[PDB]
Structures are given as structure tokens and as C-alpha cells.
Amino acid sequence: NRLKEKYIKEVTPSLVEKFNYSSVMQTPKVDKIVINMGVGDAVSNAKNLDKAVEELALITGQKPLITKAKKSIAGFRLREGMPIGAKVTLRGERMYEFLDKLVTVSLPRVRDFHGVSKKAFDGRGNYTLGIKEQLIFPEVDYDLVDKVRGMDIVIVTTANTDEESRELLAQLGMPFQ
Amino acid sequence: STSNGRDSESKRLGAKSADGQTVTGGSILYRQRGTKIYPGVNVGIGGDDTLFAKVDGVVRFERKGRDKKQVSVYPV
Amino acid sequence: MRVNITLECTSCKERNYLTNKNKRNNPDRLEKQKYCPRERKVTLHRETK
Amino acid sequence: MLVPKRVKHRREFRGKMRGEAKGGKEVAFGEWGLQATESHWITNRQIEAARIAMTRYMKRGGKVWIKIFPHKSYTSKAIGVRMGKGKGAPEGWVSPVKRGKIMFEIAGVPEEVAREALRLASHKLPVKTKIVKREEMGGES
Amino acid sequence: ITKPDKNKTRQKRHRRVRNKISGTAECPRLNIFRSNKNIYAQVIDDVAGVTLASASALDKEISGGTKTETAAAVGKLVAERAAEKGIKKVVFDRGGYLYHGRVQALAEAARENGLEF
RNA sequence: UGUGGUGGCGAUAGCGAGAAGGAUACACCUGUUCCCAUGCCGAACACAGAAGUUAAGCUUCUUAGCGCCGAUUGUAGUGAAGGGUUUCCCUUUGUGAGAGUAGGACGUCGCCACGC
RNA sequence: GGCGGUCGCCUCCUAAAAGGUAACGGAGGCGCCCAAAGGUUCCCUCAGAAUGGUUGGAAAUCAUUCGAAGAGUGUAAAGGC
RNA sequence: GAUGGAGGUAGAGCACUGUUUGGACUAGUUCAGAUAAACUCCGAAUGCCAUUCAUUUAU
Ligand SMILES: [Zn+2]
């Protein structure tokens, strides 16, 4: 779609030269994108995962999973298997459209332009964004929203050393500092 | 004035036929809890892990790889 | 809550089996396809009211 | 008195010492040792009495290693009570010591202070003893 | 990330198929290999540890299609060739695959041309 | 011979470090029309393929750092037969460890297919 | 002797490397539960730790890398997996 | 007497669970040293079960 051209036409020559890759298999990629919502409020009101899921599906053409307890802790009134949050996974074209709407439309709606921190790379080459609310997107609306909540993002790639992903990630967008 | 004092009946577990002994079909070879010993050629397992012959032959206790044991029965 | 029970055949009316159930878990009557020895056949047996 | 935190069993058997030490028969951390030549039980109070006597004599400190720990409990019944019902209540702690075991170690102090201190510790104890030094290996400083 | 190889994940299922299936000389073992461009087949007895017949996908002379149709030819070939060696009573080891796709094609062709399963 | 497959034998067969290789084969890789699939996702499993590449798996070769297999002689115990106080200790005769070591070891045996 | 406790059944130690073995010896459980928590066919692999991530904190839920078992097994403990 | 076997005791060991002493360290793992009846990576002497076996003997 939009970036396969961009890879095979701007970036793969760059990255293949910057680290002197003897093969093109060696060039990193983007494998997944996984979205998280930590609700933690089906504890009280059962009608909270519902809105979380409505918003996340307004984003992407995909009904999200439902993550449950996985154990029972009394600090949060948790039994086992109390459905807590929802998640989504994105392959192929769902990833490039979503990255494009992240870099070119949605993200800059956030003010105080701190972009993306750099203590955010796991030490192995995958990256995780951060979002506080939901209003940052053109798929969301004004009134329908009722809570200030936002979503976690993780972008996983095939890279050994962090800096390789640093470049392969800035080169496609994601306006770092 | 003690609160101990109770036990259960002994169960007579162990080996009921020897290595190198000839045996007729159906005879018990070993009573156990769980598989301490495993079943081999021409031997079955019961409902509570007892091992029995299926065929008449001689009994041979062997070694199952590195850390397990086997019983087999071999007809003449 | 657990109660012993009898399942009765539905064509020849012979009580062929004895079994269990929990009657706050299963409120209605059990129903199984069991071999009926009088007719030498598999038949719908049902629990005696 | 030394006491084990958190035992797993409240009572246990006693026997059967049958002397010969299984473990530390050489000096490990100090320069001088106190080795038992008979086999006996040694209690909390005997160890503390010996330790206090040994440390008081060494003005300017030095260092002292106690190498014997009471793991095993006692029990006992009371006067005026007939034989019969279950074990008594636990009263005490002990360690069994077999002949050969080194029990204390001292360093940082010349011979005579160390020898006098080990002499004063042994009169507090129910065993016969010797005094030993680190003798000869690949390296003994 | 580390994608695992598929061949080890199917060795791990093959070793559990084989706790039941095994082949003697009255009832040899019809095995199957399925690679990215072929499928193979051997007829194996295990007390002696040997092969009695075989047929391979695109090694010898099969072609006339390159859909699943390559498999049915191999099934028919091992059927004929094993009936040449006095063999009718084999047992089928799937490998670790499903009895579903182009392994089912080979198996079916085996059952039409001489081998009772 | 080389490679693919499928088997026996207690890892002496394993782990980690290092190199090399694409002849066929093995793989990664490319797609979702059709058989089938995701408690979301063609990721997997299923199928259609053959642009691209030896980077990763795979194969071969070097390495005794980690595991594994370890003798010999000395002890500890203990069958029989005897002696002191009998808590415990000792002497004859037979058996003999666990530790700790000298050494071994980077597999060995077999069937099928194709290529040289 | 009385008062106190105990009286059937299961698991461990005592128990002396087959089986068996006392004491008002040392420790615990049972008098049920499950219509699936039974049968069978396919498929799967755990507990933790470290790193990042908005609410969210040590610890709910996401991603990666180490991880032979340090988990689970309706219910006591042993033997098994 | 010879040959095969089942089994965890006397040792002694710290891989697993309890109990425990010194030292280095750091997050803000390590080096040594002990110990056990209900601990075990290990493991005897003897006893026990067998055998178309052998030599004496009489059950
Ligand atoms: Zn009827």
C-alpha cells in the first residue's frame, strides 16, 4: 500500500547501507501492532468494558478480544476470570493504515509536543507508545465519550540492536523528539 | 491424654513374581502407587497401577532408557 | 442435595439402572439412551417420578 | 541462648551419637582451634558460658567463631507424674558433638592470650579437649 | 521475535502419534513426508528397521498437474508398487499433520488401488 | 561420495563459543481466488505458487568453559568368629562405598531416495 | 480403679533397604463431590524474573528475552505425571 | 555354591525441602563451613524371591 513502496524505494537501500547488510533478508521490518486497554473497572460497573470495546472498534475494523483476570488478588476485588480489558492485534495492511493515521493525522492533536520518549525500547528493538485519552483520532466523536481514558500501544519489529529500530521507526514517521 | 493414635491397614505392596520365573496368563507381577515400574512386552496395567501378564512365559525385569524400569514376559 | 435414583425404561417399563444426581443442579429428570436387557436394544430410559 | 527460629517438628528422637565427627575437623577461619576428644551433648547455656569467658579475656578484641549450633530439642515430664501418656513438653536445646569436632576458633591475638582463653573456655564444658593450630596445606598464610 | 521452525513443532506431534502406531512385517507402516514443494511416502517395518517400497512426488514421473493432484498420483504409485511385494495390510502414520488436505489425497488413492487400512 | 527422509542404542549422543555452505534436495520468502481457519488477527493451521536469499533454521567442521561416563588404592559401614566398661570402644577373617581423583568424550550402528 | 480421652476407615514416620510388626508413641484426613470435574478425537504448555507502557499503585491487563518444572493435578499425605 | 532380580536402611551428601555460621557484595548474586525421624544427586554388608543348575542330606 503506502509504505511497501516506501520500504523498497527509500528505506531498504538506506538501512542496507548504514549497517552494510550483506543480504536484504537482514533488513528489519514491522511484524505486529498490538493495542491494549487496561479497564480494571468491570470490578465495579459491568458496563465499562463495553465502552472500551466500542471505542477500540471505532478505531479499527475488528472486534477486540477480552482479557480476563488470570489470577485473583484481593487488593482490587479480583477473583479469577473476571473480564478486565480488551486487546487488538494488527497485521499486514491494518498496520500500515494505522501507522499512517498515527503519524499524519491523529498524534499531533496531542499538545505540548514531547513526541516520543527514548527510554521506550525494551533494550531489544521493539517500541511501545502511550496515549492518555481517546479524542486524538478522527474515528472518535465529541459527545459520545465520557471518560478520560486512553490506550496502550506496542509496535514489535525484527531488530537486534535498539538503534536499528530507532532509525527504521523514525524513518517511517513516529515524530520522536 | 494424647491426640495421636491411629493408622491404616498395611497394603502388601511390592513384587509378586521373581525374575526368571515362569508364569501363567493373568498372574500379578507388581503392586504399586503410580508407575514406579512400567509395563513392557506382553504386560498390562490395572486400574490402580498393578501390572499383570497377558501370556504365559518368563518374567524379566529390565531398564527403560536412563532412569526407568520395565517388566516383560517372553513365551518359550 | 445429592440423591440416589432409578432410571426406568420407556417402552417395556423396567427399572434397569441405579445412579446419582444433584437435584439443585439438575432440577428436571435425567434422560439417557441405555441398553435395555429385556428387549436387547438401546432405548430411552427415564427417571422415576 | 541460641534458639532455632521456626522448627518443623515439635518433638523428636534423641540417639545415637556413636562418635566420629562428620564435618569440621580442621580450622577454617581462625588461627587456633579447640577440638573435642570425647562425645557428648552440648547445650545453649554451656556455649554461652564458654563464649563469654573466652571474649572477656581478650581486651582489644580479636575475633571468635562459634562453630556448633543447637538444632535438636529436649523434652521432659514433671515430678509426681506416673509413666504413660505422650511425650513431655520441650525444655531446652542441644547439639550432639562427636570426637574430632573443632568447636571454637580465635584470631588476631598472639599465642598466650589465645591459649589462656581456650583454657578458660574448656572448664565450662562437659568434654575433654585439645588446642590446635592451622598446620600445613598449599596455603596457610 | 523468534519464529520457530515448523518441522520441530511437527516432530513433537509425530512422536505422540507413534506411541500407538507401529509397523510389523504383516502390517507395515505407511509413513508420509510433506515438504514445501513435494510429498513422499515409504512403507516401513520396524522389527527389522527397513523399507519395503516407496514413491516420491516429483522425483520420478508423476506430473500432469501442480495442485493437490500431485499427491493422489503418489498414493496410487505406492499402492501398485506395494501390491507388487505382496502387501495389503498397512497402518497409516499421518506424520504430525492433519488428516485433511493433500495427505488425505495420498491416503485415499492408497485405499483405491490395493492397500487395506 | 553429498543431501533429503525414517530407525535402534543410558547425553561418551547434550549446552555455549567459532567458522563455512546452496549442485539437486530442505528452508525462509510471495499471495488469498477455491478446501479449511482466528474465542481479534491467512500470526498459526489450509491451500495456490516460485520473484527474491543464504541472514535465520538445516548440514559440515574447530573448541573440553557447563553438563554427562568415569577406574585404581585408601578410608566409613558391615556377614562370621572373640575381648574390655558395657553409654561406648578394640582385635582377627570376609565384603566395601559416598567423596576425591588418573582417564574418556564434540557420537556410533542400519535401511530407502536422488544427485557425483 | 475413678475423672480425662479413645472405640470403624485412609496417608506418612517409628519399621532394623522383600512382606509383616507394639505402646494412653510422633503428625494429618474421611462418613463426600462432579451430567462434567465422565468417554473419545483434534490441538496446546507451566511458576516466576528482568525491560519498557496512560490512568495503575510493588502487585489487575499488554510486548520481548531467560526459565525441567521452582506450577497444576475436586478434596489429607505419600508414590506418580 | 553359581547366576539373575525387587527394595532406599548403615554410611555420607547438600541437587530438593526445613534448621544454620562467617565474608564479599548490591536492588535499593557470590566464596567458603555445617545439620536432619517424618530431607536425598547417591548408596553397602546381610537378609528375601527365583532356576528342567550343582554337591551333600531327609524330609
Ligand atoms: Zn424396555
Author numbering:
A (entry chain F): 2 to 178
B (entry chain X): 18 to 93
C (entry chain 3): 1 to 49
D (entry chain N): 1 to 141
E (entry chain P): 2 to 118
Sentences from the paper on this structure:
Ribosomes are the ribonucleoprotein machines responsible for protein synthesis. Here, our goal was to investigate the structural conservation of the Enterococcus faecalis ribosome compared to Escherichia coli, a model organism for structure-based development of ribosome-targeting compounds. In the analysis of the E. faecalis 70S ribosome structure determined by cryo-electron microscopy (cryo-EM) to a global resolution of 2.8 Å, we find that structural differences are located predominantly in peripheral regions, while the organization of the functional centres and antibiotic binding sites remains conserved. The cryo-EM structure of E. faecalis 70S ribosome presented here revealed that the architecture of functional centres and subunit interfaces remain conserved when compared with E. coli and S. aureus.
Structure determination by cryo-EM using multi-body refinement produced molecular maps that reached 2.8 Å for the 50S subunit, 3.0 Å for the 30S body domain, and 3.2 Å for the 30S head domain by gold-standard Fourier shell correlation. These maps were used to generate models for the 30S head and body domain and the 50S subunit. In the 16S rRNA, larger structural variations are located in solvent-exposed and peripheral sections of the beak (rRNA helix h33a), the spur (h6) and the body (h7, h10 and h44). A similar pattern can be seen in the 23S rRNA, where peripheral regions show structural differences for parts of the 5S rRNA, for the functionally important L1 and L7/L12 stalks, and for 23S rRNA helices 9, 16, 18, 28, 33, 54, 58, 59, 98 and 99, among others. We observed more significant structural differences for the C-terminal domain of ribosomal protein uL15. The sequence identity for uL15 between E. faecalis and E. coli is 50%, and the rmsd between α carbons of the two protein structures is 3.4 Å. The E. faecalis structure contains a number of loop regions that are shifted with respect to their location in the E. coli structure. However, two short helical regions that are visible in the E. faecalis structure but absent in the E. coli structure are also absent in the more closely related S. aureus structure. We also found structural differences in ribosomal protein bL33. The cryo-EM map for bL33 is consistent with a zinc-binding motif, which is present in one of these genes. For bL33, the E. faecalis structure is similar to the zinc-binding paralog observed in the T. thermophilus ribosome.
